[PDB]
Amino acid sequence: MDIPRIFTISESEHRIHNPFTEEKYATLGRVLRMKPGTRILDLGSGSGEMLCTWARDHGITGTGIDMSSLFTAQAKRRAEELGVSERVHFIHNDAAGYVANEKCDVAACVGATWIAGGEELLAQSLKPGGIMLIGEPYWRQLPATEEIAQACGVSSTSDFLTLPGLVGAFDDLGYDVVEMVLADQEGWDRYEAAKWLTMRRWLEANPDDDFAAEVRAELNIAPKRYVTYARECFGWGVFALIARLEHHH
Amino acid sequence: IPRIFTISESEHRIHNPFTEEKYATLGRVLRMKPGTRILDLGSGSGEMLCTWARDHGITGTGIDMLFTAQAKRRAEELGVSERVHFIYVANEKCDVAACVGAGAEELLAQSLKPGGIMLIGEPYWRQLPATEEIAQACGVSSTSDFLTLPGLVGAFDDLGYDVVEMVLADQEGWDRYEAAKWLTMRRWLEANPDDDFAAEVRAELNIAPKRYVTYARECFGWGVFALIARL
Amino acid sequence: PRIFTISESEHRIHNPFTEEKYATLGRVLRMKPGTRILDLGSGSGEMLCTWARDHGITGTGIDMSSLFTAQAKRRAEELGVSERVHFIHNDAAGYVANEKCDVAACVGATWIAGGFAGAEELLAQSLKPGGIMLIGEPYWRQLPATEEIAQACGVSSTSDFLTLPGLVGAFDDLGYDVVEMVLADQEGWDRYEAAKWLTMRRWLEANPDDDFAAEVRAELNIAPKRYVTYARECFGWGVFALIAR
């Protein structure tokens, strides 16, 4: 159950695998008002940009658990490049099978793909009244019918939760949402459009590869499928939750 | 003033949808110059004057109250220091009045010079609330409390002024303003749990996030309108 | 008309785009330093000057206005890159570059050819094979329900422009793959329309005796309303990176 060729082929140039932009991650760490030293656990650190960049701006400590590459010296050298490899640590580990030395103040997991979600680990290693950063997808605009949804590339509307229904889901789970950074059309266009050019280059790079057909097909509808439905429907964003905990009374 | 407003915006830098970038854009867009005099009736946080005072070397004086204290900080901290002040009619007729945060036209008028610019921060209906109740949920008495965007520009026109510039707020701007309130409240509930007016702040935070994303996020509109009298 | 020259004499960018939106286009375009560009109706060459400063591209911009061609030449000089770009005063309705260009562009001034399908014939006549073609065209962000409304947005008919999917679907019907897209946002529109309202007023108080004073004053009287009441919701804008299939 690997990753579909198309996805990987049409995202090999992306520096961010979701609608978020540099300005967005930058803002995130800002609104979080984290004091220097705040330890952070980041599952799915990937490039390690978030942790690295925050480490230099808000001056914090942290550790990323990447599950997308054999060696993660691409991020380890990233912290060195920013002169902060003494604060941010990285480990080639895949989610489960992990226990932190000491709890942290911010546990993040934006999720690999913007479509997927992933938390015991996130909660087991988070200090009481800690912030839990989670990137989740939602319906920016609830499609009028399954028809439009199925077109966007989704079984039923019931697959995604609407924004108000998403904040309603966190509350019913005992979670107290205290922050929210949502992506915008611009963020999305950058993410979705960047693919169209990447595929068109791939074709000019491997014309003899019998897969050019699947790319050609994808390209021929990619921009159409996006502007016609997805653009207005698909929504994404990162929520900062803080679980309601009962105390000694 | 519900103290909640003082708590939810306990550490806000801009007590309105506007962002830092928004206040700087209004300034340059107004193509002002060194020697301009303003009167911010409703100064609030005080970011507007301080900011422009720096990147535009402009005089001025804000009025409000006690955020007046908060607005004082920035002045000393920015390097401007007494280029703008904080503490209604002015006996100097500012080169440009303002009321960020109609009807308040009768005031700015009695304190603005002829052919002068008039800034007006006024909220509006970015999108009419599907139904009265929805509008009541957003925290407003009735739909008639605010006017649509075109309705508001039409009001300014029927008052003699022409809109020469206008900087409105965007969703992003709103989230920043609304979300921050949630975090500030939850920080208060953990700093003053065994105090009074907490089981109420606990109520605000219990609904604030739900209320916003559900109704307000796509109805609440705001922005400042620069106006110059005609005739 | 001349109302265009008066209201946009101070503008730096003559469309809903913003400083950031231009930077984005040029960066997402992934251009190697040395790329030759051709802008037809480059207005104040703000697009060629900036990309030449942050990407090392080269190009020339043709525009009917001498005032803009002046601002462009002055702009390239200001950014210290007047060596990479060249601005000439001339017509673009039928311009053709002596040498093919890595990217031919007609952003905004797509009316110089007819609409946008006529702009394809032009650029494509000086664009290296598999070259990138930029097209700045407005679209119905929200297709109106009656010609009245459309007539109240400053246009003649709803057939004047297409919708986002109708527009991209149109570039396709011409055998072009839309590989990149940078759409403008309402904010970008405000900065564009609002500027005119202040320029016209400023020009009005500085030329109360010019022949077009009557007209200008008339434009101002309804421009703010004409926009916020209609246009700001039905109109969309953007640049589309194209490349022959």
Swiss-Prot record, chain A:
Membrane-protein topology: Single-pass membrane protein
Alphabetical keyword list: Membrane, Transmembrane, Transmembrane helix
Pfam families: Methyltransf_31
An annotated Gene Ontology molecular function: methyltransferase activity
This protein's record includes keyword Ribonucleoprotein: no
Transmembrane segments: 104-118
Domain of life: Bacteria
Gene3D superfamilies, per database record: Vaccinia Virus protein VP39 (3.40.50.150)
Gene Ontology CC annotation, any one: membrane
Name of protein: Uncharacterized protein YjhP
Organism classification: Bacteria, Pseudomonadati, Pseudomonadota, Gammaproteobacteria, Enterobacterales
